[PDB]
C-alpha cells in the first residue's frame, strides 16, 4: 500500500472510531522513515491517545474497585481484581512502549535543526507517554519513568521557550501537561503553579502574537491553565 492509502485508512478508522486500526495505519506511515506533516502528526497523536486512553480509563475503574474490595476482605475477589488490573497495565505499557519506540527511532530522530514545532510536539508526546507509564508504576520502576518524563518535558520546554511564541498552541499545550506532571506525578504543587502561571502570564503579555487561524486553540489551553491554577490554589 502507498503512503496516501495508509493516511486515508487512518482518516476512515477515525470516523469509524476504530483507533487500533488508525494507530496501526499511522505506525506504518511513521515506519516509512519520511517526516510527518501537521495533519499526519495529529492523526498519529489522536490514534495512540485514544488507544492508551481506553486502558487508562479501564485501569482507573479497576483500581477504584480494588481499593473498595480490599476493605471488605474477599480473598478470591481481590486476587481476580489485582490480576485484571495487571492485565490492563501490561496492555497500557505495551501501547506506551510502541509509541515511545516510534518517537525515539523515527520521529524525534528525523527532526531537522530548524524543525522546532515537530521537535517540541514529539518531546511533549515522549513526556506524556512516560507520564502514562508513571501513573501505573510503583517503586524503582516508577522512579525510572518519572525521570524519563521529566527529561523529555524539560528538553521540549527549553526548545519552545527559545524558538516558539508564548501564545503558540504547542508551547501552551506542553506547559499544561508539564504542570500536570509536576502536580500529579512529582507532587510538586509550587513548581506546577509557577509553570502554569508563567505560561499564562507570558501568553497574556503577548496576546498581540495570537494567530487568526489558531487563536481559538491557544485560548482553549489558556482557559485550562487558569482552571488548573484555580483548582491547585483552592486545594
Amino acid at each position: 500500500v502507498d503512503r496516501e492509502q495508509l493516511v486515508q485508512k487512518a482518516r476512515l478508522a477515525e470516523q469509524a472510531e476504530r483507533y487500533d486500526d488508525m494507530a496501526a495505519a499511522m505506525k506504518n506511515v511513521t515506519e516509512l522513515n519520511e517526516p510527518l506533516s501537521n495533519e499526519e502528526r495529529n492523526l498519529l497523536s489522536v490514534a495512540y491517545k485514544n488507544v492508551v486512553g481506553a486502558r487508562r480509563s479501564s485501569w482507573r475503574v479497576i483500581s477504584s474497585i480494588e481499593q473498595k474490595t480490599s476493605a471488605d476482605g474477599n480473598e478470591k475477589k481481590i486476587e481476580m481484581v489485582r490480576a485484571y488490573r495487571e492485565k490492563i497495565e501490561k496492555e497500557l505499557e505495551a501501547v506506551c512502549q510502541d509509541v515511545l519506540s516510534l518517537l525515539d527511532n523515527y520521529l524525534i530522530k528525523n527532526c531537522s535543526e530548524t524543525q522546532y514545532e515537530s521537535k517540541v510536539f514529539y518531546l511533549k508526546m515522549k513526556g506524556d507517554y512516560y507520564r502514562y507509564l508513571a501513573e501505573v508504576a510503583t517503586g524503582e520502576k516508577r522512579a525510572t519513568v518519572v525521570e524519563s518524563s521529566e527529561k523529555a518535558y524539560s528538553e521540549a520546554h527549553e526548545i519552545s521557550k527559545e524558538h516558539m511564541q508564548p501564545t503558540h498552541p504547542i508551547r501552551l499545550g506542553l506547559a499544561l501537561n508539564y504542570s500536570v506532571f509536576y502536580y500529579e506525578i512529582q507532587n510538586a504543587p509550587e513548581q506546577a503553579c509557577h509553570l502554569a502561571k508563567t505560561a499564562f502570564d507570558d501568553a497574556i503579555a503577548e496576546l498581540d502574537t495570537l494567530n487568526e487561524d489558531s487563536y481559538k486553540d491557544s485560548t482553549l489551553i489558556m482557559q485550562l491553565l487558569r482552571d488548573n491554577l484555580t483548582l491547585w490554589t483552592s486545594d
Binding site: 500536570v180 489551553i221 482552571d227 488548573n228 483548582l231 491547585w232
Partner: peptide, 6 residues
C-alpha cells in the same frame, strides 16, 4: 482533579 491537553 487537573485536566491535560485533549
Amino acid at each position: 482533579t487537573a485536566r491535560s491537553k485533549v
